[PDB]
Design a protein around this ligand. Structure first.
Ligand SMILES: CN1CCN(C(=O)Nc2ccc(F)cc2)CC1
Length: 282
């Protein structure tokens, strides 16, 4: 079926939970043996969210190459993304090592450091220009260059220096700051505006390594971001845009990381975002 009318048909019939449970039943199951090794317990935020072995990002290190991060490679859309958990106190150096080694240009953050009165990720970037951060375990230096605070999101320019080689690179930090503590946004308008700002920066384009996207677990809000982006790109590329099937795209993405889209409300919000976004594109 088309999307917008499939949408009203699920609303009128109140069957979002049944649609979402079908997706969960059909999703791929691949091994995640490296994630479950005992030496990696303090590298995982949640015991039930792990990268598959076949798609995990490897650190360029011979001691321990493990990070909770996955490469999502979308062949028809010609887009790639790295989806990862919010960094932990003992993985902030690994996080920036990955950004460096994968040649990423942008980092997309969809959570606040504290939500619901608890810490959802480490404070992994500097908040003042004159107070830079040094990650001694991976030999990197990170400096805040500029910050632009808007009503729904903040954009930061950061300098990452590889202290072994003295090479430097400019990294863009795109921080969506207004996702509610509970539920999903009422309108997709600010989320779509944010997606378009990431696109306009070049961070999603083939001349760079894959964008790094995270929330707390790296599957819920993060899944909504890449699902909406890929569906809108396919609607531009194909002769028949009504052939784009958001459930099929989501199942393809779940071949590369488990659990993408965590609730039926997140699934409905993803439909809404693609539907409204397709009208603005034209
Ligand atoms: C002001 N300009 C913007 C480009 N720029 C940069 O560093 N790009 C980049 C390339 C490759 C990579 F992996 C990360 C960033 C700094 C100079």
């Amino acid at each position: 079926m088309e999307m917008e009318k499939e949408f009203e048909q699920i609303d009128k019939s109140g069957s979002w939970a049944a649609i979402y449970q079908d997706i969960r039943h059909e999703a791929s199951d691949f091994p995640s043996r490296v994630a479950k090794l005992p030496k990696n317990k303090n590298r995982n935020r949640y015991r039930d969210v792990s990268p598959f072995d076949h798609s995990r990002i490897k650190l360029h290190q011979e001691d321990n190459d493990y990070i909770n991060a996955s490469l999502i490679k979308m062949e028809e859309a010609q887009r790639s993304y790295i989806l990862t958990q919010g960094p932990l106190p003992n993985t902030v150096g690994h996080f920036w090592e990955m950004v460096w080694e994968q040649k990423s240009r942008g980092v997309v953050m969809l959570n606040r450091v504290m939500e619901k009165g608890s810490l959802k990720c480490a404070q992994y970037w500097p908040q003042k220009e004159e107070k830079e951060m040094i990650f001694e375990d991976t030999n990197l230096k990170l400096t805040l260059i500029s910050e632009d605070i808007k009503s729904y999101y903040t954009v930061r320019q950061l300098e990452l220096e590889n202290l072994t080689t003295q090479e430097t690179r400019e990294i863009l930090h795109f921080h969506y700051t207004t996702w509610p503590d509970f539920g999903v946004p009422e309108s997709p308008a600010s989320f779509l505006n944010f997606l378009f700002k990431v696109r306009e920066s070049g961070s999603l384009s083939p001349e760079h390594g894959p964008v790094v996207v995270h929330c707390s677990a790296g599957i819920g809000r993060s899944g909504t971001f890449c699902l909406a982006d890929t569906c809108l790109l396919l609607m531009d590329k194909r002769k028949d845009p009504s052939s784009v099937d958001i459930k099929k795209v989501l199942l393809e993405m779940r071949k590369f990381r488990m659990g993408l889209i965590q609730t039926a409300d997140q699934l409905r919000f993803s439909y809404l975002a693609v539907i409204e976004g397709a009208k603005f594109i034209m």
